[PDB]
Design a protein around this ligand. Structure first.
Ligand SMILES: OC[C@H]1O[C@@H](O[C@H]2[C@H](O)[C@@H](O)[C@H](O)O[C@@H]2CO)[C@H](O)[C@@H](O)[C@H]1O
Length: 278
């Protein structure tokens, strides 16, 4: 409540379309040394009536030191389900809710902590709200089930200079390695991002005319098996700026002319939950 910026609470948003299996709602924010609690709700209602069903209610309690989940329907609350609250008053929070056909999978700090079985129709979720002692800094709802190996084209402009490709993924618990390729029309790979847990390093290289280049590694692998990560590839003037979980992990000098990077491939031991061009 010190600064504004955006996402002022009480925050409310009407979904373009009902929440569907494979989609994720991401909520990030800051709390104060005096914060007591805040809530995240997936609710029904018409358009602004407010008071209908609440398929999923999440209460983050600093007083009780617990994260509590419940559902409200037909004018009554069900039995609450609890998990420990890993957060201390102050410091940032990162809560993500992914819908599936039988439950919601909730992660805290990119670690899965709760599987909440649906008690009422997921399709009943038409809005979501966030309120309480929290300063919201980021909110996003989208994604789908991305099959892996994955391959797709990038818009018309592609990963052009000044743009960034954002990928939300989770390295498999017992996976060994995975990769992300940013390609050009002819198949050359401008940037090959290859985390190798068996080698404790992320390999970066380019594939030009069927041949692999030098290879840039080292920098201590910031990823961890089973934990979600936010990968951002920023196309800048002289090089790609690779961010991992909000921190610049490395830079990669362009070996191929930037511009026209209109292809994407993802493979290996990884689960993809979101891809956006920002
Ligand atoms: O260095 C990136 C590059 O690795 C190639 O595999 C390398 C391997 O990393 C290296 O240890 C070995 O000595 O040579 C291999 C190539 O013959 C991958 O094939 C290539 O796709 C890039 O990922």
């Amino acid at each position: 409540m010190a600064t504004e910026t955006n996402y002022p609470v009480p925050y409310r948003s009407k979904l373009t379309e009902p929440f569907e299996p494979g989609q994720t709602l991401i909520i990030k924010g800051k709390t104060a040394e005096d914060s007591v609690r805040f809530t995240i709700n997936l609710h029904n209602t018409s358009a602004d009536f407010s008071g209908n069903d609440v398929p999923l209610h999440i209460s983050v309690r600093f007083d009780e030191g617990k994260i509590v989940f419940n559902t409200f329907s037909k004018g009554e609350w069900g039995k609450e389900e609890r998990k420990s609250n890993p957060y201390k008053k102050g410091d940032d929070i990162d809560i993500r809710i992914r819908a599936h056909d039988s439950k919601f999978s909730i992660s805290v700090d990119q670690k899965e902590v709760k599987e909440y079985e649906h008690r009422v129709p997921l399709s009943s979720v038409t809005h979501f709200s966030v309120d309480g002692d929290i300063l919201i800094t980021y909110i996003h709802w989208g994604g789908k089930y991305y099959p892996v190996p994955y391959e797709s084209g990038l818009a018309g402009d592609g990963l052009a200079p000044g743009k960034s490709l954002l990928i939300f993924a989770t390295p498999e618990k017992k996976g060994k390695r995975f990769h992300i390729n940013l390609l050009k029309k002819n198949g050359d790979i401008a940037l090959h991002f290859n985390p190798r847990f068996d080698e404790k390093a992320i390999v970066r290289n380019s594939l030009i005319s069927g041949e692999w280049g030098n290879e840039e590694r080292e920098g201590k692998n910031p990823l961890e098996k089973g934990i979600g990560c936010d990968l951002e590839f920023r196309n800048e003037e002289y090089a790609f700026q690779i961010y991992v979980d909000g921190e610049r992990f490395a830079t990669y000098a362009h070996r191929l002319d930037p511009h026209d990077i209109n292809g994407l491939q993802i493979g290996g031991d990884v689960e993809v939950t979101g891809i956006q061009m920002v």
